[PDB]
Each structure stands twice: as C-alpha cells, then as structure tokens.
Design a protein around this ligand. Structure first.
Ligand SMILES: Oc1cc(Cl)c(Cl)cc1Cl
Ligand SMILES: Oc1cc(Cl)c(Cl)cc1Cl
Ligand code: SF4
Ligand code: SF4
Ligand code: SF4
Ligand code: SF4
Lengths: 449, 420
C-alpha cells in the first residue's frame, strides 16, 4: 500500500554532514548590491512596446496598461474580457501593499528597521521592558525551538538556521539617505557599505551600515507561493502570488525581529536586501541551488520565496540537505529550454560569472540576468516560467519504494508521455493548499535535534 | 465537508438579529476598554492605572516569578519570558490594541497616500472606472482576494447602520503616535451624499452609496487558546490582530484597484459580531461571540465597507441558540462571573451593552477587571466552549504556518460554487 508522504522523513534521509555546501575559489569577493540587474545602470533601462527607453519597471507598467485595454492577461494571452484582465492586475498591485519599491531592499528604512526602538509596537510595550531586559535563555537548543515556533506563527512555511557566511552579505547596499521622504526615494538611491565591527548593536552612521561582529547566525524562512497561480507564468496571476508573498515576507521579518528583540537579543530584517537569500537558504538546509539559480526545496521546489533575519541569538545550525537536485539539473534543462529570453545556460557549472550581475568565485550555473530582466517589460510581469516548468514545482514528485524516499524520474521526461479557471478554482488561506499543508507540520523533534 | 454543512444550514434572507423600537447606534467610547468608568484598574500593588498598564505590571511580576499566568508556574523564567515575548511581538502590525482609530495609521479610508499606491500610480488602477459591475463576478473576485489576504472565512452582507458606531474613538490627525493614548477623542460617524469616504474636522463621513460590508474570519490556534488565561492564549490573539490589519489593507487596495472605494476597520467603526452574523459566518452565542461551524468562537473578526456591487450571503442557523440555551459552560467557567446564565433580553446590563437587540447580556466591566489580575486577555470562555473543539507541551508540540492546523485546513478550501 501507499506510504503516506512524510516530509520530515525525507529531510532526515537527505541530511548532509555539517559544512557550507557552496564550493568557492580564490576570486570570490563580496558583491555590491548595485550590480543586480534591477539596479545596475547597464540593465536598469529597457524599451517599452513603443520603443521608448525607460526604467524597466515603467516600461513594464506601459505593457500592463496595454494588456488591460486589450483584454489580455499576459503577452498575446487573451483574457475572458477586460474586467478579468483588470482584476488580475488589481490583485497583483494589491499584493505589494506591505513592500517598499519591489523588495524592501533599503536597510534600516521603512519596514526594515535595524532597531525596534522607534516602532509603534515597541513604544506601546515599553513599560514591560522586554527589549531592555537581559536574556533569560542562553541555551541555543531551547532558543532554536522558541525561535522556530515563532517563525511558523509569523508565516514561514519553512525555517532553517545557519552560521552567517559573510561572503553572501552585500559589500555595499542600495539605500536612500535618512532624510529623503518616500516620494523621492526612487530618484535618490545611493550605495552604502555594509561593514562588520566590534560594536554592541547594529547601527547606521552617515558613512556605513555596521553589523556587530557578534552577529553569528542567520534565520532563513521559506514563504510558499501558490501552485495554480504560478503555473500561469508569465501571465498576471503568477505576478499576484509573487506580490502577496513579498508582503508576507515583510510581516515575517518584522514579527520575528520583534520576538528576538523581546527575548533580549538584536535582530536585523532584510527581505530582498542585505545579502543573497539563495546562498543563505542552501547553507541553512532549506534546499539546494539549481540550474535556474533558485533554491529548490523538497516541499515546494523553487516555487517558494525567501527572506532572512540576522541575529546574535545563540542557535543550533541546521544541516544542509542533498536530495539529488544537482544531478537532476545536470540532465533536465527544462527551464533553459522554456525560458522566453534564453537567459538560463544549458552548459556546466563554472566559477566564472557570465556578466557583472553574477558573483564570480562560487560554483554555480551562470545565467544572463540582463536577458531575464529584458523579458519583464515585454511580458508586463515578473515572468516565472522557469519556476512554473520545473518538475520540482509539481506537488507530485516523491515516492517511497518500501525502503526509502526517491524522486520519480517520470516527471522529468521531456516531452511528458487558463486564468478564468484559476479565478473560479481552488483556493485557501494565503493561497496555501490543504492537500499538501501537512508537509509543513512541525514538532520539537524537527525544530531542534 | 464544510461547504455541504454551510449550505445545509442556510437561512432565508433577512437579518436574524431581533431588534425593538428602542435600538439606537452605540457610541464606541462606551466599550469597557475606553469608558471612564472601566478604564482605570488597580495593579497587584494597589496602584490605580490605565487597565493595560496594570496588566503590564502583572506580566513583569509573572516573568520575575517564573509564571505563565496567574498561579501558573512556568517551566522556568526563560519559558515565562518567551511567552510574553511572543505575545508582544504578535501585535507588531496593530495600533494601541485593535486599530480602532478610523483613517489613522494602517486604517486609512483612502489609498492615495500609501506607498504602494504611489509606486503603482502610473498604471492608474485606482483612477480607472470599474471594468466589472456584475455583482456575481465581483463577489467571486473579492472572495478569492480575501483568501489570498489571509481570511479563513469570508462573507458579504448589506451594511446595517445599526451596528456602526454612532461616534468613533480616534485622535486628531496631526497628533503623533507617542501622544495618541493621551489625546483620544470622540468623533461622529455619519452618512451623507458624497462621492468618496472623507473625514472633516468635525465628522467621519461614509457615503450613502456604501452598500456592503465584507466580513473576514481569522482563525486562532486551538492548542494556544486552550492555555487561557495564560500567555500563549495572549500570543495567538495578538498574532491574529496583525493578520487582521494585513487583511484589511490588502483587500482595501484590491477593491480600490478594481475602481471602487473601501473602508478598513479591524476593531473600529462598528460591531464585528453583528456584521459576522448578518454575513453568515456564524451565530451569536451566550458568551457574546460569533460562533462559526469551522472554529466555534476561536476565530477573530475584521471587516471592510465598500460600494462594490456584491451578492449578500445567507445567514446560517446550525442550532447555536438552542445549544447555548442549555449549555452555560462558559458562564460557569468564567473567572469573573461576567457571562449570564439567564435568558436573552433587549435591555443591557450596563453602559457597555447596546440595548434594543435580543442577546445574552453580559457584564463586560467584570470581564475587563480580570485582565489586569491575570496579566492577559483571558479567553477562558472561548477555550471551554464545545464548539471550539501545559504551555511547555505547546512550545514543544504541533505547529504549522500562521498557527493553522493541517488536520482541519481542508474545511476552508473554496471553489467558485461556494463563493457565489
Ligand atoms: O524581486 C522583484 C523585484 C522587482 Cl523590482 C520586481 Cl518589480 C519584482 C520582483 Cl519579483
Ligand atoms: O481586543 C483587545 C483590546 C485590547 Cl485594549 C487588548 Cl490589550 C487586547 C485585546 Cl484582545
Ligand atoms: S527545470 Fe530542470 S534543470 Fe531547471 S531548475 Fe528545475 S530540475 Fe533543474
Ligand atoms: S523568470 Fe522567465 S525570463 Fe527569467 S530566467 Fe526564468 S524563464 Fe527565463
Ligand atoms: S474573557 Fe474570561 S473573564 Fe471575559 S467573559 Fe470570557 S471567561 Fe469571562
Ligand atoms: S460554552 Fe456553551 S453556552 Fe457558552 S457560548 Fe459555548 S455553547 Fe454557548
């Protein structure tokens, strides 16, 4: 008979021995955040459908407007009618409500404060003194159980702990000056170094963002996206599950940082800022790096967002996981074949970046992320076709042979041997799926060993 | 199958709340949280303070004494601290315990100044007339969005103005957060022939076109609520308040980007239990909460008011009134004897009740008096209610995302057939 799926068993079977799995060489340097395709001058500008050269997201806006006017949900994808086209973009736009300028990347601004002292919640609770009282727990075993329980309350579907590897922290962040109001933010972005110094608390000066040398650990959260909506990539409903999860990321960071602070430690939120989430996620054991470049998890494949929190709270690092992703990506190449911009390489992993957007000196599949971003104004969205077509995104993949768990190779056969229906179809709270939600149930035994 | 149950128990259309000719709209300042007769309570040292500051003093005393609640020893001081840290953190996205000030902080009545609206302005979704006016399609769209936005239950009713507060508790618009608690004022909520929700110096003005209310249920965690009146029940309460706030903002933005207006509220603007009953989420109960089939009373409520055309849901009758008539378990377990064992009447027991509607009349000042004593938000009534069915074992035990339970999460799956 069918053995019922056991995500905890799977993770136990594929756990590695301790050690960062990412292979590096001597040309590795920390990466300036301005180099990402979203921010770098070489990639920031893209034509719209009229050939006008604009900040890429404004050219994408032009395409969203054009699609609604033409009753489309995506490029050359007719909607049922204009109202359906409208509704998909309204859902997408609303999803971003708790996120600043697509990703919350500016450290210590708006929602990403490095201290809780000015927050309305901290002020309201100040008489209790939780943020000023020294820790009552220093045992990393108990702290790991407490903080992972809090992480699940705060909306994480996956949570893991790693020692902080500074190689993945940006050398300089993209931010804005502290006196710049929101309306000017996109016009006044600057770079600012992230440095590690012997100070008691995270602090920002006029010149530097300063992380204490005591900042030992990073807590990584996975925020699951909705399968039915992502499968509409590159059309509007994939944009909406992306957007809603960014606001879930923001709430997670703020909730968890406040818990850590109220336990007597400090905590730095980040969302898409501060450092490279995929590397932290790999080192914390959420999953493995992949050909497309995302972290692939056993529960969700790559169809999961990441955020992370940095802290001096003593914790027990989790073990990395190896469930064969590298070997499957070596032979699969579905994302590379389906990518509308041919951004994903079909070749082997190297240590040499394809362009300025890649960090050289770590072994990975090297993709052209200017090509990727170039497709976003064209399609009017955040694409996601690679996530949608990846076999690991199917809910389907795990089988038990009577002895152990394995991946069903039939899902990788190539070839295998609409948005109205999404709006009319299955949904549940936060877009989670009750057919698989058991996979992320947690007891103490799987929070800390 | 929960969708079958809810259809089995649908009533004919029509508000099930029985009223008489005495009913009048209720001033929000009359709640026990705010009213001058109930606001000040002694702490354990005998010092009279705002009730929540006296409750703070009890939380500190409990942590120092390694306790999770009144007369409830924790495993150690570390565990006691962790429960209060979790509770305090849960409130991160909530202003002064409930977001009641309308059109302040997170509860803005227009989206125009929000950072998300400004970023999206070149698309013009909030300026573009609606492309959809069909209430059937809009009901399906907005309910799908409500589930994305974190509602475990969602219902629609016509707006009954009887449950809208006659006057809100708020603060002047330019008062900074740090002075808010000391500068709360009353302000009338009125309905007028105006295009958009608007606030003047003198009035909060809701348009006469504001036809509908969308009510969301936000499920609390059963294991944590069963620790009431101890700290982990406080924590699931607190986290759900921040889920409420996110829900309101997300859904208001969706409705605005569809071409309509939307008023968020959380614990402000009007009486959530009455809206929830009229929208079919559940039935009124002896303790005074809305009892749902999926969660009993262990669910929080929030609501959004809009002119978006929608199809009202039917109220539901699955026998709560007859069950509460003979049960009385909440009344017997209540640590303050706040809940009556008598029959329902139209006359309130005190200023905190709205007279003129048939309900079990409870003494809510007695309830609030137990909160500084116990250092929390009690919830024993919710915990012991049959419809709802130590702290170290909770921290070491089962949990899942947002505190939801995969053993029951299938009950809130939704398809178009059950949305409209
Ligand atoms: O990570 C992202 C960054 C930006 Cl700038 C956009 Cl528009 C969308 C996504 Cl998903
Ligand atoms: O509704 C509430 C209001 C207040 Cl003021 C507190 Cl402290 C707690 C709860 Cl649950
Ligand atoms: S589609 Fe195939 S090659 Fe691409 S990331 Fe997924 S498994 Fe790897
Ligand atoms: S998001 Fe789209 S364009 Fe970018 S790599 Fe994936 S498939 Fe290619
Ligand atoms: S919250 Fe506690 S004190 Fe208040 S009515 Fe319920 S049982 Fe009684
Ligand atoms: S405990 Fe009994 S009387 Fe009280 S609300 Fe629940 S069912 Fe009704």
């Amino acid at each position: 008979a069918e053995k019922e799926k056991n995500a905890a068993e799977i993770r136990q079977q594929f756990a590695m021995t301790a050690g960062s799995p990412i292979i590096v060489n001597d040309k590795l340097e920390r990466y300036a955040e301005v180099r990402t395709a979203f921010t770098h001058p070489t990639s920031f500008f893209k034509p719209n459908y009229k050939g006008e050269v604009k900040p890429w997201f404004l050219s994408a806006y032009d395409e969203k407007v054009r699609q609604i006017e033409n009753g489309e949900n995506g490029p050359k994808m007719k909607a049922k009618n204009v109202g359906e086209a409208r509704a998909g973009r309204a859902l997408e736009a609303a999803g971003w409500t708790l996120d600043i300028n697509y990703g919350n990347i500016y450290p210590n601004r708006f929602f990403m404060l490095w201290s809780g002292e000015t927050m309305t919640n901290t002020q309201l609770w100040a008489p209790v003194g939780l943020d000023r009282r020294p820790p009552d727990t220093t045992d990393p075993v108990e702290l790991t159980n407490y903080v992972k329980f809090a992480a699940r309350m705060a909306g994480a579907d996956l949570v893991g702990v790693a020692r902080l590897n500074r190689n993945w922290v940006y050398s300089e962040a993209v931010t804005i000056p502290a006196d710049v109001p929101y309306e000017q933010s996109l016009h006044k972005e600057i770079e600012k170094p992230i440095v590690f110094k012997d100070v008691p608390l995270p602090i920002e000066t006029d010149d530097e963002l300063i992380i204490p040398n005591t900042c030992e650990n990073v807590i990584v959260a996975g925020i699951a996206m909705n399968r039915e909506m992502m499968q509409t990539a590159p059309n509007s409903m994939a944009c909406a599950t992306t957007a809603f999860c960014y606001s879930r990321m923001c709430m997670f960071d703020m909730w968890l940082c406040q818990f850590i602070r109220y336990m007597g430690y400090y905590a730095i939120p980040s969302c898409n800022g501060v450092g490279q989430s995929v590397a932290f996620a790999v080192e914390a054991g959420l999953g493995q790096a992949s050909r497309m470049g995302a972290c692939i998890t056993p529960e969700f494949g790559p169809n999961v967002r990441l955020t992370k929190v940095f802290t001096n709270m003593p914790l027990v690092p989790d073990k990395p996981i190896d469930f064969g992703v590298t070997e499957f990506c070596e032979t699969c190449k579905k994302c590379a074949r389906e990518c509308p911009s041919k951004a994903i390489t079909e070749g082997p992993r190297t240590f040499e970046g394809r362009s300025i957007h890649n960090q050289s000196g770590k072994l990975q599949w090297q993709n052209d992320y200017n090509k990727c971003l170039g497709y976003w104004p064209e399609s009017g969205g955040y694409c996601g076709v690679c996530v949608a077509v990846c076999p690991f995104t199917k809910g389907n993949i795990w089988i038990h042979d009577g002895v152990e768990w394995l991946i069903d190779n039939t899902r990788f056969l190539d070839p295998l041997m609409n948005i109205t229906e999404v709006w009319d179809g299955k949904i549940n709270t936060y877009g989670l799926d009750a057919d698989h939600f058991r996979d992320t149930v947690s007891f103490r035994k799987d929070r800390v060993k």
